Structures are given as C-alpha cells and as structure tokens.
Amino acid sequence: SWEVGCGAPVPLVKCDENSPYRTITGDCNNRRSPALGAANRALARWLPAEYEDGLALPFGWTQRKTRNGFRVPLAREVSNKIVGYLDEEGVLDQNRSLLFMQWGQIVDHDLDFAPETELGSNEHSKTQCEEYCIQGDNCFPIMFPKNDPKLKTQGKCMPFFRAGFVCPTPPYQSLAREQINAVTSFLDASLVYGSEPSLASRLRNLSSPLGLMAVNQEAWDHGLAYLPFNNKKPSPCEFINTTARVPCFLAGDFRASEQILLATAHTLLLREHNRLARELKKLNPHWNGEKLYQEARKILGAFIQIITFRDYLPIVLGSEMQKWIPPYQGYNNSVDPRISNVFTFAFRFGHMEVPSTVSRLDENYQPWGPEAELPLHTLFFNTWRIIKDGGIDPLVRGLLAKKSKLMNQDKMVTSELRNKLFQPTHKIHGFDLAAINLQRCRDHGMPGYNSWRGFCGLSQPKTLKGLQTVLKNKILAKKLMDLYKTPDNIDIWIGGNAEPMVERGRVGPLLACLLGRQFQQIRDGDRFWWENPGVFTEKQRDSLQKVSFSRLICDNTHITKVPLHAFQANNYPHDFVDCSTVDKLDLSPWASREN
Ligand code: HEM
Ligand SMILES: *[C@@H]1O[C@H](CO)[C@@H](O[C@@H]2O[C@H](CO)[C@@H](O[C@H]3O[C@H](CO)[C@@H](O)[C@H](O)[C@@H]3O)[C@H](O)[C@H]2NC(C)=O)[C@H](O)[C@H]1NC(C)=O
Ligand SMILES: *[C@@H]1O[C@H](CO)[C@@H](O[C@@H]2O[C@H](CO)[C@@H](O[C@H]3O[C@H](CO)[C@@H](O)[C@H](O)[C@@H]3O)[C@H](O)[C@H]2NC(C)=O)[C@H](O)[C@H]1NC(C)=O
Ligand SMILES: *[C@@H]1O[C@H](CO)[C@@H](O[C@@H]2O[C@H](CO)[C@@H](O)[C@H](O)[C@H]2NC(C)=O)[C@H](O)[C@H]1NC(C)=O
Ligand SMILES: *[C@@H]1O[C@H](CO)[C@@H](O[C@@H]2O[C@H](CO)[C@@H](O)[C@H](O)[C@H]2NC(C)=O)[C@H](O)[C@H]1NC(C)=O
Ligand SMILES: O=C(NO)c1ccccc1O
Ligand SMILES: [Ca+2]
Numbered sequence: 001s002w003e004v005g006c007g008a009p010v011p012l013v014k015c016d017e018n019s020p021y022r023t024i025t026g027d028c029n030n031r032r033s034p035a036l037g038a039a040n041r042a043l044a045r046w047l048p049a050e051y052e053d054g055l056a057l058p059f060g061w062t063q064r065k066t067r068n069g070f071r072v073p074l075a076r077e078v079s080n081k082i083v084g085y086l087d088e089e090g091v092l093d094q095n096r097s098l099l100f101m102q103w104g105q106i107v108d109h110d111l112d113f114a115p116e117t118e119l120g121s122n123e124h125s126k127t128q129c130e131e132y133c134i135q136g137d138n139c140f141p142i143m144f145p146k147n148d149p150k151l152k153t154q155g156k157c158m159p160f161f162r163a164g165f166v167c168p169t170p171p172y173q174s175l176a177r178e179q180i181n182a183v184t185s186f187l188d189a190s191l192v193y194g195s196e197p198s199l200a201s202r203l204r205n206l207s208s209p210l211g212l213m214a215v216n217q218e219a220w221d222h223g224l225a226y227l228p229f230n231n232k233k234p235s236p237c238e239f240i241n242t243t244a245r246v247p248c249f250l251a252g253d254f255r256a257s258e259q260i261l262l263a264t265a266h267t268l269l270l271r272e273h274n275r276l277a278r279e280l281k282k283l284n285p286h287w288n289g290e291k292l293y294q295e296a297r298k299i300l301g302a303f304i305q306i307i308t309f310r311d312y313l314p315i316v317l318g319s320e321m322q323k324w325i326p327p328y329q330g331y332n333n334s335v336d337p338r339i340s341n342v343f344t345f346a347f348r349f350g351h352m353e354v355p356s357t358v359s360r361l362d363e364n365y366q367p368w369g370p371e372a373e374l375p376l377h378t379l380f381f382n383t384w385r386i387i388k389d390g391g392i393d394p395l396v397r398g399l400l401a402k403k404s405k406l407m408n409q410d411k412m413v414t415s416e417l418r419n420k421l422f423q424p425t426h427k428i429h430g431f432d433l434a435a436i437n438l439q440r441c442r443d444h445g446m447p448g449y450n451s452w453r454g455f456c457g458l459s460q461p462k463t464l465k466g467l468q469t470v471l472k473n474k475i476l477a478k479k480l481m482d483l484y485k486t487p488d489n490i491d492i493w494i495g496g497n498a499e500p501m502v503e504r505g506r507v508g509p510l511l512a513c514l515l516g517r518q519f520q521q522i523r524d525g526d527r528f529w530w531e532n533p534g535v536f537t538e539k540q541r542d543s544l545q546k547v548s549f550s551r552l553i554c555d556n557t558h559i560t561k562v563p564l565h566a567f568q569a570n571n572y573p574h575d576f577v578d579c580s581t582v583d584k585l586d587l588s589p590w591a592s593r594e595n
Contacts, residue, residue, distance in 0.1 A: 037526075075434075104312070164180045260395060268552060280295055328531050355405040376414065561577065
C-alpha cells in the first residue's frame, strides 16, 4: 500500500457519469480515479520532497544544519545581490505586449493556489511573527541581511507564513509534508466560476432565470458591468485609500484584486459570460437558467484553453514547444492531470516580466490625463482607480499598446515588486516578491537546481566554470557560487530563471521542460479538453477556433480599434484595425431544435 489513504481537506460528493458539464471542484473528470485533478488536494510530487528533517522543516530553518555541507543563503540576500537593479531604461520586451505578462498570471491562477496557513484571528501569532520576528511553527521570517536599508527603515524581518497543507492544519507528524492546491488543476476557468460550490453559487445571479453571474449594483462602466464587491471587512482595497473606501472585487479566485490589471482581465471574462449567456438565451428561448450558465461556462473554458495553447504557449516555449507538447492525439485516461509542486515555482518566471509602470490611454491611445503613467506599487489591491478613474477601457488599451518587461540576467525583478510589494494581511508597501519566492521554495521542500536539470535530462554543473557555460554569464555564475557554494543548493526559482532564453521563447531549457511537461499533461488528461471528440460538435469546434483576445475586447468594451495579434508588440495606429474587421464567434451551431 503506497501512501494512498489521507484525504480530508476535502469536500466529498457523488459523480453523475453522463453529465456533459464539468463539476465545479474538478471531481469526476477522470472516471477510474474521480479525485484526480480536483481542488483542495495535494500538489503532485514529480520528485521526493527535500526537507531539513526529511519530513517538514524547510532548509534554512535550523541555523546550524546545512544543505550538502553548506549554509543556505538568506532569501533576501540573494534578492539584493542578484535579482535587483536600478535602471528601468532598456528593459522592455520589444516583441511582447503587456497582455503577454497578464495572460500568464491568469493561466497561473486557473491552475494553482497554495494558500498560507491561517489558524488564529485574535491571536498574538500574527503579532509574534511580524512584531518580533520569532521563528516558530508556521512563522518562518525572512531575515534582513546586515547592510540592508530595510533594517534602518522597516524592522528586523519580513513576516512570512508557511503554506497550508493536506491532511490538517495542526501538528501533523510522519509522512512528508504536502502543500495544498486550492483550485482545480484543469484549465477550466475556475478563476471565474470558483472551485467550491459554496463560492460558485454566490457568484451567480440566481434571482433571475438567465444564467448570469452577479454584477456590481453600486457602480457601472458606461453601461457595462463590474465584478461585485466583496462582503468581508477589513478589505485591503479600502485600506490603501480610506477616503475613497472602495472594497476589493468578488471573483472565482481570491487573488483577483492583487493588481489593477488582473482585476481588469477578470472583468472582461465576467462580461463575456453574461454576453454569451444572454446571446444564448436569444437562440434557445426554452433553455433554463442552469443550462444557460453551464453552456456559457463551457464555452468560456474552451476560449481560455484555445488562447493559451494556440497563442500563448508557442511564444513562451518557442522552438521547444514541439518537443514537449506534440499535436493532440485525444484523451488519455492514464495521464496524471494534477499540477505539480515545482510547476507553481516554474510558472513564476512571470515575475521577471512585470514592468515598473501601468498606463491609461485615451481613445486615440495617447496619455489619459496628467497622471496617466503610474508606479506599479500604487496599484496593488487598488480597485478605486477603476471605479473612480475612468473604468477599464483606459487600462485595456495600455494592455494592448504597452510592452512587457523582458527577462534580463542583469535586471531580473523590478523594485516595485522587489522592495514595495503590498501583502493583503499587512499594512506596508514594503515586501519583496523575489525573497518570498525563494523562501517559499524552501517552504515547499523543493529539490535543488541540479536535481531538476537531471530530471529534464540536462547537464548538471558542479563547478563555477560548469555553471558559467550553462548560464553563459561569467559574473552571474560567480555571484551564484559565492552565495550558494555549490550549484546543487541553488533554489529552483532563481536557477531556472537565470538560464538564457531558448530560441523564439521567453524561458530557458530547464523551465521549458518543466512548463511543457505540465501543460502536455493537463491537456492530455482532461476529459473535457475542447478537442476531445464528443465534448463539442464538429461545427461547434469550427466556430470556437476563430476566437481571439482581440474580439473579446471588441465585444466587451467600448474600444473600437484593436491589433490582430494581441500578444506581440503592436504600434498604434499602424498595427490597429477596426473591430468590425475582426472575426466574431458564431454561436449558431449552439442552436437546438427539440421537435
Ligand atoms: C503583484 C503580482 C503580479 C503582477 C504585478 C504577479 C504576476 C504574475 C505573473 C505574470 C505570473 C505568471 C506569468 C505569476 C505567477 C505566479 N505567481 Fe505572481 N504576481 C504577483 C504577486 C504574487 C504573489 C504575492 C504571490 C504569492 C507568493 C507566495 O509564495 O507567497 C504570487 C505567486 C504566484 C504563483 C504561485 C501561485 C500558487 O500556486 O500559490 C504563480 C504560479 N504572485 N505571477
Ligand atoms: C514577434 O513575434 C511574432 C509572433 O511570435 C513573430 O511572428 C510569428 O513568426 C512565426 C515564425 O515561426 C510564424 O509562425 C507561424 O508560421 C506559420 C504562419 O505563416 C504557421 O503555419 C505556423 O504554425 C506558425 O504559427 C508567424 O508568421 C508569426 N506567428 C504568429 C502566431 O503570428 C514575429 O516574427 C516577431 N517579430 C519580430 C520583429 O521578431
Ligand atoms: C484616494 O481616492 C480619492 C478619491 O478617489 C482621490 O482623490 C481624488 O483625486 C483627485 C485629487 O487628487 C481629484 O480628481 C480630479 O478631478 C477632476 C478630473 O475630472 C480634476 O479637474 C480635479 O481638479 C481633481 O484633481 C478628485 O477630486 C479627488 N476626489 C476626492 C473625493 O477627493 C485621492 O487622490 C486618493 N488618495 C490617495 C492617497 O490615493
Ligand atoms: C440579476 O439579473 C437581473 C435581471 O437581469 C438584474 O436586474 C436587471 O438589470 C438592471 C439592473 O438591476 C435593470 O435593467 C433592471 O432593473 C433589471 N431587469 C430585470 C428584468 O430585473 C440584476 O441586477 C441582477 N442581480 C445581480 C445581483 O447581479
Ligand atoms: C497515455 O499516457 C501514458 C502515460 O503517460 C503513456 O504511457 C507511455 O507508455 C509507455 C509504455 O508503453 C510508458 O512506459 C510511458 O509512461 C509512456 N511512454 C513514454 C515514452 O514515456 C501512453 O503511451 C499513453 N497511451 C496512449 C494510448 O497514448
Ligand atoms: O497575487 C498572487 N499571485 O499571482 C497571490 C498569490 C498568493 C497570495 C496572494 C496573492 O495576492
Ligand atoms: Ca482550474
């Protein structure tokens, strides 16, 4: 008996085996093993976890224990000496729009979420961790180096809490610690609809038989919907501006308001569901609410799948695309569709793609107002700039017309994220996402850089010189050695991202392998994959492959000019055409006759 037993975070129910619709939780996708890919289950392990005590303590916890003979460097040190930089000039990606970064975050949020541990509201725990920086239980602080300016200004550490895990929440004790994925592993738009029946239902408009999602009642965007506000106070969104007092939005995913451009994409998707559902009510007047909801939902999930696999993946993986994701051959019930623990770190290549500012453009795509270009850090958990400063059209135009940041070995992550991150649970704009990613690697018990190179069949450098040749960078390799003392101890997030980009792509070999395997598996092991015979009809398929992010914008905003290939860098006005030139989604194939 393999470690097959434990199952408890978990909400349990029965499977209607002939339902043409996915469950909200992901259960029932695989017929022989119904829990596969479901939400609130453990992240899969492609390799055994590596903890300090073999079971649960992260490396770096016990200051005297080493990793292969050496102390592991402080997360914030590595951040300071390797990841930071000062000059934002020359840093933009010349052939990827801001939308390229933004889509990655959306896909990521549909596939994985490992929430921090809670246990204790009205507990000195949240206090003992932030106020005193005392390591202990789920408090695993990021200590500041000596010479770090945050020491003079912020305190002795940045609080950090370990990720939730399967089985409990209490002192669990024997088999290795496994973190939770709170969302469904299938690319199914769970970030729009929710992963729990509890939330899925609350998101819906059930007082009307139209199969629509609830929309904001306090505010409108020139007649277009906004996501509803969240009930819960205190909300970090009203905190960043107690005068405006505008709460975070309520969406299928809890991270929706982390930054204004993410909330903007969530709004576009909410609108498409309603557009689709009312458009479907027109062709099938007899269909009921539930049918409208499920059928629009199914359509929206196919859209996310199509854009991801047809438009997005090919420009991340480049020439490695064909190597890891061969053409679709059909559903394979033997494939594990679960998202792996390491994927959630590999997919973090996106953090190095975020630029320092966000712009709002007017109708001619020229600056909108006098304070049109804003620093990223003022937009974390900011919903007021949307409700009170022009709606989403100005931000959407920036998404289309501005560029992503390009990964650069000398310029990894912007200070907006590296020194000024705002955490929903705390009150300063002073966190470091890079140090957090590093610390989280250790928290999730990740094998080191060389373990993953071997897994992907790549050479494994043992020397500084071996490491120079792989990174193709003498000094980066050297700072890496000085901090880590052996390439075996290099945290995967930084190791993976330090490698040069493959041809036509935006990640290196190690990441291409880790990303590509994962995507191949969630496609091949998804019974509801859009191309799987029987999910949609042939005619429905011919209609779905004409979707494009450009059309989505046209139908759901007041923007009338869009580029044809939204993910590449596009210059206004030459690369911008009229919305009426853009292929629409033909829903006639969804018309039924029941006589
Ligand atoms: C602010 C943040 C972003 C933009 C300004 C941002 C952006 C991205 C991109 C573009 C990603 C992929 C293409 C991506 C992936 C994942 N992130 Fe990240 N992200 C912002 C902020 C955060 C924060 C805060 C976290 C949590 C860090 C922690 O470990 O505590 C974060 C994480 C992740 C993540 C893991 C999700 C999970 O499985 O739990 C990605 C796959 N991002 N982000
Ligand atoms: C900026 O990036 C653009 C998109 O990545 C790129 O254009 C793309 O170039 C590739 C070259 O491989 C072509 O790829 C397509 O080739 C044919 C289409 O003629 C198809 O049969 C293939 O399946 C594949 O999709 C495309 O012509 C184009 N890709 C897309 C999706 O439009 C530009 O070259 C880049 N610009 C610069 C200046 O480098
Ligand atoms: C917190 O949110 C506040 C309200 O949203 C915001 O104040 C608002 O923004 C500015 C003040 O700086 C004013 O906007 C402008 O309005 C017209 C443009 O249509 C101009 O002609 C005006 O001169 C003015 O500059 C709003 O009047 C103002 N609203 C209120 C109620 O004060 C704050 O700036 C936000 N504070 C922080 C710290 O973010
Ligand atoms: C649920 O749907 C109903 C019906 O579509 C929404 O109410 C309508 O929409 C707007 C704003 O309320 C107005 O044109 C009418 O007052 C309503 N028409 C009808 C037929 O009721 C309602 O806003 C939705 N509720 C939520 C919470 O989203
Ligand atoms: C369905 O997926 C399974 C699991 O990934 C595939 O298994 C392959 O089959 C060989 C033996 O025939 C196994 O050793 C490997 O796990 C897989 N091959 C390789 C090269 O790794 C299987 O091929 C798939 N089945 C179908 C019908 O496509
Ligand atoms: O935004 C996030 N990820 O992309 C995020 C992830 C974990 C915790 C909170 C957050 O805001
Ligand atoms: Ca999902």
